[PDB]
């Protein structure tokens, strides 16, 4: 039974799980886009979002600095978190990362995902785009919308 | 032959419109049943 | 516990060729509009994703040359500028990674 | 490797049987195969049938026009008259006419109540390609037939068969030939039903006209028996009554089918082709 | 060993007559000595039977089994060979007429067990055979309907004779 | 066994014997070695027996072919197209006569299981039985427990 | 396979050359007609002499009739795949070009009529003792009506028509081995003029694939 | 005049005759070079047969995906039916329902659905009553329903179709879809078209207008099964493209004094863009309202 168990069992135990996730998060902050098994990226995505919130507290917040010191194994990245990543999302309250499934890994056919911090300088991923508003179905609905708005104003 | 779902082919503009449209009809349908005794009830 | 009798090919065919054991047909394969190669509806196109990765790798090698060592991450934002382009007003104060090629069409300047 | 030769030879024979079975060879004329003497085969043909054929006429009966035209084409191709071979066209016409008139006489005497349309259909069935070719093939007519194409076309085989009847007519006369037609063509009606040979449509319509000719009231259809009316396997017996007297009764899976079958039963009784009618008399004429 | 499958692309038929129907092109291709199990390969060969060349290629491109890549490789070179050497007009107008795997020449190796005991391990190889026929894929058989059963049942009732008598 | 072999119904060739009897044996082909010992009985059959057998059966064309052979054979062909090859290897002249006479009397149909020891196209003269054959009819054909004129 | 074993006394005995000694370029508009002239003729006369040297009883006038016979019989071997007889009528340079592409195809070719008599346009000889062998090539011009219908492996009409004859103007080159005591005259190759009209179209439609570009690469017109 | 069944046999014979004539003009098998100018498969050249090979044949050279997704062809920048033979060396592009701007594809599907309505309406009424096909008005897709103007018999001047009758028309349209009939096209001169549609006055007037617009006075003819009609532009390849198809309402146009023109209306979605049951019902409601072409 595992009702309401929100965390996955990975690595060699609870500690190794954190270390596994910490290495993925450290790589993400440096490179701003990484690929890894889908489940591991999905688990780490929660930490990657909260790290920005700690970065927004500022480098003068001792609690935020201790959190960043633990989760960033490369100390040159701690200035980046507080002075590059956190200011970039100053005007957002969430959704700092985007996660997309990519083709299965060649060797072991593992389900794979790419995760990146939005607003990076890297070439954009081929994001999935919705059908154009000019398609047959969307034009039929646009007419239905126009009609309803006209009937309400009357 | 490929499976489809309701908002598969809907564009960014039509997804909010459809959600609002169907939601309002549900609310209107439920509110219309609040007077059972005034709508030809069966013998009590 | 060992097998008491040999299992016949008739029995084995019923087990091996059962519909559960067969490979299921996939109905979520579609053509990629950008490149024309096949893709799954919920997965990124392999051909397009590889193209993006190749350019991402080239830019990352350039970033390495500018950093010139470990533990040298910048404290300012970065902008990739291709041949024939100069920094914009919004690109001031950002590390400029110069790429010796023409800007890819799919890569839009911002 | 084992010593010996017999086992290998025996296996070679079987390997040739399997090779042949996998790839059956195209059929060829019996004349092209070994052990064939046309003159001897022609003589045995008549003796089997207990008929004193004229070897001159019998040989001509087998010669067809297609074989003559092709034989000449081969002569021209080889740059080689001596091919003044008479075809069986004349003999075929004589035999065909005699057979039709002879069969019409046999059938009219046996079943005096069958109209001309019925008797014509029976004669057309007995002289048809299917019936005639079946009889001809089982009498070695195809083996002795000289044709351009093998297997012999059905129309060519039918023509050759009637040529043999013509040859018998000139050789032995009509009485001897009448027995031949009785023994090999009339016999083909042994177990076959009237309407299996005479294909008709709308039997009820034909019955109504016949009863009018006989000055009998129109037949009234009535349900004599019934079972499983509401099921997927009904049984209906529909009886036709003329002046409230049963003339025929027929079963069927539906009332319409049973009614139509009853009309056929009424027609069979009217014409004398009942299943239990007197069998044909094949005894030697007195 | 036998190599009859490669000799079937060398059969020259005689010129067709003016009134005969156009004969579909048939292309036989195979790959020999694949380091993969024939039992596992059978499932992939079973998948694409009767499929169009394009549908089979799509199914194999998104399969996780190792045999899928090999079969896709064989199908592509067979498709190219059909148009290049067998006078097939449209490369897409092809369907899988036959696809099956065969046993290859295998090697034996020792597998070690405890207590000084051993087993004999087989390094398995397999063949893959494919036949491509020109034309659209044949339609699947419609499920036997209730009308067909009822017609068949009544047919068996009607062929029923009185047994062991005249 | 019956289940492992084919079968047929008793039948004739072109209703043989109905109007007239026609011998079905149509051709006989012998192959007798001049010097082979196995063909000794076949040579003795060709010297005194084959000529008298042909006189009695003028409808059968017999082909005697003398050629080197280790196994002498006789091939019988019938009007219906059946071909039968029978060995006469090392058989006596009396044994060969019996075999040849047996071939002369056969119809050429397959010597396989015959389902019934009799055949007829008119099994019934009074009407084949059906469930209503011996059932009495009822006034107005009323069914059991059926109310009339309601 | 390019060279046999090294330091071997035995060598490969070639019976033909791989190309034409001096390619004869036909005058433009020769199909329409259907100082330098002497210089070319003198070169032909010189070469003809060395041809009559090894074979005294040689006549240039008789060759165009013989050339047509070799040409017709060589093409007739393609109809029945009589390769054994073909090697005697064609050289080892011509044999691959004639038969390689029709190995699994049915060729129905026929000769109808000869519009214009054959004319020996050029006669030339090889450099003396290339490897102890001397060759003589006689270019001939043929204007004849031919019928060709090629079928594919499955007996389906692939090219041409089986009953419509069309005009063919082609300059067939022959070659003989003079030194060989058993050498003969054999079809060697064909000259295709640049101005020659394009061949009749094929029956089936064709697609020419564009560049297969890897992800990093981009399509440039 | 000719009976309805004989009228189709005459029109089909004339249509077939003109088709055979245009095919004979082709000298043997002339070859054209068609360059692919699409974003995918760039640079592909097709060496096709003039006046025989259609855009569909070019898609067949590429893959089955092109054949299934291509609804319309863009030949030298002009919309081109998938089954219309190519006449010259040109550039070709393939259009789908899901393109960034599928305006042209929408019109083709939108025109084809109207033509399928005309087919069922002509063959739905009893032989007693006369059905006179008028035209297929060009109404924008955003209007919510495609319309087809028809003139019915004087006897049916007070008759309005019932809901079961509207459902009867829909079942006939779906039968046309199940048959999977191709849209055969023919570009003929006004004279040929006028002969085919001589018995119908409205078509003659309509045919004359289209011929006048073009200097060469060639009119575009289309046929599905045994139904021939005149069109405004290129159509879709086959009727099997339609998945959801229903005729919604029949309106009586005004003024009714000269003649009572009845506007039959419907709405449909292809297989590629099929809508959900709930969403489809909302579209049927708007389709039942009268549309006024502008
Ligand atoms: Mg684990
Ligand atoms: Mg040990
Ligand atoms: Zn892509």
């Amino acid at each position: 039974i595992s009702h309401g168990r929100v965390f996955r069992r990975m690595g060699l135990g609870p500690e190794s799980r954190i270390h596994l996730l910490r290495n993925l998060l450290t790589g993400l902050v440096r490179h701003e886009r990484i690929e890894a098994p889908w489940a591991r990226v999905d688990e780490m995505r929660g930490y990657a979002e909260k790290l920005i919130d700690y970065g927004k507290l500022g480098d003068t917040n001792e609690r935020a600095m201790r959190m960043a010191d633990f989760w960033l194994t490369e100390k040159d990245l701690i200035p980046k978190l507080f002075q590059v990543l956190a200011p970039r999302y100053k005007d957002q309250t969430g959704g700092y990362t985007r996660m997309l499934q990519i083709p299965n890994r060649s060797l072991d056919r593992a389900k794979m995902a790419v995760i990146e911090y939005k607003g990076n300088c890297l070439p954009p991923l081929p994001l999935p785009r919705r059908d154009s508003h000019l398609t047959l179905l969307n034009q039929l609905l646009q007419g239905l919308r126009q009609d309803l708005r006209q009937s309400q104003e009357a | 032959k490929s499976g489809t779902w309701w908002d598969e082919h809907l564009s960014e503009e039509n997804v909010p419109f459809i959600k609002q449209l169907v939601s309002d009809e549900d609310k209107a349908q439920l509110a219309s049943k609040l007077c059972p005794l005034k709508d030809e009830p069966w013998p009590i | 516990a060992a097998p008491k009798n040999r299992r016949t090919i008739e029995v084995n065919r019923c087990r091996r060729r059962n519909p559960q054991k067969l490979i299921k047909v996939k109905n979520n394969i579609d053509v990629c509009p950008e490149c024309g190669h096949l893709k799954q509806k919920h997965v990124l196109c392999a051909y397009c994703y590889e193209k993006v990765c190749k350019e991402t790798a080239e830019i990352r090698r350039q970033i390495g040359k500018q950093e010139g060592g470990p533990f040298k991450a910048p404290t300012i934002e970065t902008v990739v500028l291709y041949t024939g382009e100069t920094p914009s007003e919004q690109d001031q104060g950002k590390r400029i990674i110069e790429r010796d090629r023409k800007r890819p069409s799919w890569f839009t300047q911002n | 490797v084992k010593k010996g030769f017999r086992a290998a030879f025996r296996f070679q024979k079987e390997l040739e049987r399997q090779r042949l079975l996998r790839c059956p060879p195209p059929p060829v004329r019996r004349s092209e195969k070994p052990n064939w003497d046309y003159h001897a085969e022609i003589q045995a043909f008549g003796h089997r049938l207990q008929e004193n054929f004229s070897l001159d006429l019998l040989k001509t009966a087998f010669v067809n026009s297609c074989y003559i035209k092709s034989e000449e084409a081969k002569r021209q191709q080889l740059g080689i008259v001596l091919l003044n071979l008479k075809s069986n066209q004349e003999l075929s016409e004589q035999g065909t006419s005699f057979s039709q008139t002879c069969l019409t006489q046999f059938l009219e005497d046996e079943y005096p109540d069958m109209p001309t349309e019925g008797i014509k259909n029976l004669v057309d069935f007995l002289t048809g390609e299917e019936v005639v070719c079946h009889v001809a093939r089982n009498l070695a007519v195809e083996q002795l037939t000289l044709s351009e194409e093998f297997p012999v076309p059905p129309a060519v085989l039918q023509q050759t068969f009637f040529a043999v009847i013509g040859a018998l007519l000139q050789s032995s006369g009509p009485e001897r030939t009448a027995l031949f037609i009785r023994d090999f063509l009339i016999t083909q009606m042994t177990g076959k039903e009237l309407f299996e040979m005479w294909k008709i449509i709308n039997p009820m319509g034909l019955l109504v006209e016949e009863l009018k000719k006989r000055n009998v009231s129109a037949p009234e259809s009535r349900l004599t028996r019934q079972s499983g009316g509401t099921t997927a396997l009904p049984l209906y017996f529909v009886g036709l009554y003329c002046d409230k007297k049963l003339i025929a009764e027929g079963p069927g899976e539906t009332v319409l089918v049973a009614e139509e079958e009853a009309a056929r039963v009424a027609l069979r009784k009217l014409y004398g082709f009942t299943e239990n009618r007197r069998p044909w008399n094949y005894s030697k004429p007195k | 060993i036998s190599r009859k499958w490669e000799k079937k692309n060398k059969i020259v038929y005689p010129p067709q007559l003016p009134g005969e129907p156009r004969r579909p092109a048939e292309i036989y291709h195979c790959r020999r000595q694949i380091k993969y199990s024939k039992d596992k390969m059978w499932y992939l060969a079973k998948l694409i039977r009767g499929m169009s060349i394009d549908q089979a290629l799509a199914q194999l491109e998104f399969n996780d089994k190792k045999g899928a890549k090999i079969i896709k490789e064989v199908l592509l070179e067979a498709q190219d060979m059909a148009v290049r050497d067998h006078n097939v007009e449209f490369r897409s107008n092809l369907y899988i007429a036959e696809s099956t795997s065969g046993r290859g020449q295998c090697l034996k190796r020792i597998r070690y067990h405890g207590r000084g005991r051993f087993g004999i391990m087989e390094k398995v190889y397999c063949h893959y055979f494919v036949k491509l026929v020109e034309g659209p894929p044949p339609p699947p058989e419609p499920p036997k309907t209730a009308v067909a059963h009822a017609k068949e049942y009544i047919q068996q009732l009607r062929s029923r004779t009185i047994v062991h008598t005249l | 066994t019956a289940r492992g072999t084919p079968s047929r119904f008793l039948a004739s060739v072109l209703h043989n014997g109905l109007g007239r009897y026609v011998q079905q044996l149509q051709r006989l082909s012998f192959s007798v070695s001049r010097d082979g010992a196995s063909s000794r009985g076949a040579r003795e059959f060709v010297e005194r027996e084959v000529i008298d057998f042909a006189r009695r059966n003028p409808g059968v064309v017999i082909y005697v072919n003398s050629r080197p052979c280790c196994v002498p054979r006789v091939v019988a062909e019938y009007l219906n197209g059946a071909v039968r090859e029978e060995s006469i290897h090392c058989k006596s002249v009396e044994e060969i006569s019996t075999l040849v006479q047996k071939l002369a009397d056969q119809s050429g149909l397959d010597v396989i299981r015959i389902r019934k020891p009799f055949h007829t196209d008119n099994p019934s003269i009074q009407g084949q039985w059906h469930p209503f054959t011996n059932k009495p009819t009822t006034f107005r054909g009323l069914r059991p427990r059926e109310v009339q004129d309601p | 396979l390019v060279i046999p074993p090294e330091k071997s006394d035995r060598s490969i005995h070639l019976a033909c050359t791989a190309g034409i000694f001096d390619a004869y370029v036909p005058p433009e508009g020769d199909a329409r007609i259907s100082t330098e002239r002497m210089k070319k003729t003198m070169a032909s006369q010189v070469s003809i002499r060395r041809i009559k040297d090894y074979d005294a009883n040689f006549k240039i006038k008789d060759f165009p009739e013989k050339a047509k016979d070799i040409f017709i019989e060589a093409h007739l071997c393609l109809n029945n795949s009589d390769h054994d007889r073909l090697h005697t009528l064609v050289t080892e340079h011509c044999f691959p070009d004639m038969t390689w592409d029709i190995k699994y195809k049915t060729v129905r070719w026929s000769f109808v009529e000869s519009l214009e008599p054959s004319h020996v346009v050029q006669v030339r000889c090889s450099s003396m003792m290339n490897q102890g062998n001397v060759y003589g090539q006689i270019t001939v011009r043929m204007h004849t009506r031919q019928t060709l219908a090629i079928y594919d492996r499955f007996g389906r009409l692939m090219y041409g028509q089986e009953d419509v004859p069309k005009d063919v103007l082609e300059y067939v080159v022959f070659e003989k081995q003079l030194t060989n005591p058993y050498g003969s005259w054999r079809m060697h190759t064909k000259i295709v003029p640049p101005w020659a009209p394009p061949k009749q179209p094929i029956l089936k439609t064709v697609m020419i694939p564009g560049p297969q570009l890897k992800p990093e690469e981009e399509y440039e017109e | 005049q000719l009976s309805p069944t004989e009228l189709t046999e005459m029109r089909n014979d004339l249509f077939n005759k003109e088709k055979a004539r245009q095919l004979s003009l082709t000298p043997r098998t002339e070859k054209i070079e068609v360059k692919h100018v699409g974003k995918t498969d760039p640079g592909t050249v097709f060496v096709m047969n003039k006046n025989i090979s259609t855009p569909y044949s070019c898609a067949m050279h590429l893959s089955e995906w092109y054949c299934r997704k291509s609804i319309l062809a863009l030949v030298d920048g002009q919309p081109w039916d998938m089954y219309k033979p190519l006449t010259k060396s040109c550039e070709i592009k393939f259009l789908t329902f899901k393109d960034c701007d599928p305006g042209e594809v929408n019109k083709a599907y939108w025109r084809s659905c109207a033509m399928m309505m005309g087919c069922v309406i002509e063959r739905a009424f009893k032989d007693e009553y006369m059905v006179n096909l008028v035209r297929a008005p060009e109404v924008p897709v955003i209007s919510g329903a495609f319309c087809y103007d028809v003139v019915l018999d004087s006897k049916l001047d007070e008759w309005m179709p019932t809901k079961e009758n509207l459902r009867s028309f829909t079942k006939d349209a779906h039968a046309l879809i199940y048959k999977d009939l191709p849209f055969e096209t023919l570009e003929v001169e006004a004279k040929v078209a006028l002969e085919i549609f001589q018995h119908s006055k409205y078509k003659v007037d309509f045919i004359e207008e289209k011929a006048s617009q073009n200097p060469e006075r060639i009119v575009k003819l289309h046929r599905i099964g045994d139904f021939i009609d005149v069109s405004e532009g290129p159509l879709i390849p086959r009727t099997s493209i339609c998945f959801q198809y229903e005729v919604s309402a029949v309106h009586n146009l005004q003024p009714t004094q000269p003649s009572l023109i009845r506007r039959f209306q419907g709405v449909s979605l292809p297989v590629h863009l099929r809508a959900h049951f709930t969403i489809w019902d909302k579209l049927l409601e708007r389709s039942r309202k009268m549309v006024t072409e502008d």
Side-chain angles (χ1 to χ4, degrees), chain C residues 47 50-51 101 104-105, chain G residues 213-218:
Chain C
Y47 184 100
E50 175 168 341
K51 152 197 88 176
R101 70 160 278 187
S105 59
Chain G
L213 294 174
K214 314 176 136 159
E216 69 275 16
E217 293 177 350
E218 303 188 295

Side-chain angles (χ1 to χ4, degrees), chain F residues 1-2 5-10 106 108-116:
Chain F
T1 73
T5 51
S7 64
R8 66 174 177 88
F9 288 102
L10 180 63
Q106 281 174 342
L109 299 171
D110 298 338
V111 184
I112 61 169
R113 189 174 73 81
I114 298 165
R115 293 193 176 212
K116 292 181 181 179

Side-chain angles (χ1 to χ4, degrees), chain C residues 32 35 45 48:
Chain C
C32 176
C35 66
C45 165
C48 287

